[PDB]
Every structure is written in structure tokens, then in C-alpha cells.
């Protein structure tokens, strides 16, 4: 634990990036979290929503 100060910065940056990539898997109330699924499954009037 000698170099903990640098390790905390590296861990925080990696954790922020990891959480940012984890946010792509959430649909946020939509039918799916994948854009390609929405483009392939729906007409534009519901796809825009």
C-alpha cells in the first residue's frame, strides 16, 4: 500500500470508464438497450420514441 495514491487515481478512472460502458446495457425504459434491435424490429414512428 505504498503507492496507494496513484492506484486510487488509476482505479477511479478505470471504474468511471467501466460504469460508462455498463450504462450502454441499460434500456432506460425502452424495449431494448440495443439500437440495432430497435432499427430492425420497429417502424420509424415507434422507433423515434
Amino acid at each position: 500500500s505504498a503507492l496507494g495514491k496513484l492506484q486510487d487515481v488509476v482505479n477511479q478512472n478505470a471504474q468511471a470508464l467501466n460504469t460508462l460502458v455498463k450504462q450502454l446495457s441499460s434500456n432506460f425504459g425502452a424495449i431494448s438497450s440495443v439500437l440495432n434491435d430497435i432499427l430492425s424490429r420497429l417502424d420509424p414512428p415507434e422507433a423515434e420514441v
Partner: protein, 50 residues
Amino acid sequence: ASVYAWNRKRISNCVADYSVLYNSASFSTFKCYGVSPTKLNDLCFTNVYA
């Protein structure tokens, strides 16, 4: 069958042309909810039930 004893048929291991369902004018109501009607020929499904 009647609506209290509605008949459920499994559809599996087939290639399905839904374009003859959209282009047929015999259906008074053809309404899809979770999928576009014109994309049904472009997708693959399993556990299809009628």
C-alpha cells in the same frame, strides 16, 4: 376453439413468409405491438405460438 379454451399451436423448425400476411386484404385487423409488420421477414424467431 372458443375463447375460454383458446387453441395454442407451436410453430417451430420452419421458414416463414409473413409477407403473404401483410399483403393479404382478408384480415380486418393486422396489428403488431412489439415488432413492425414489415420486418417479420427479416428476423428469426423461436417459441412462436398461435
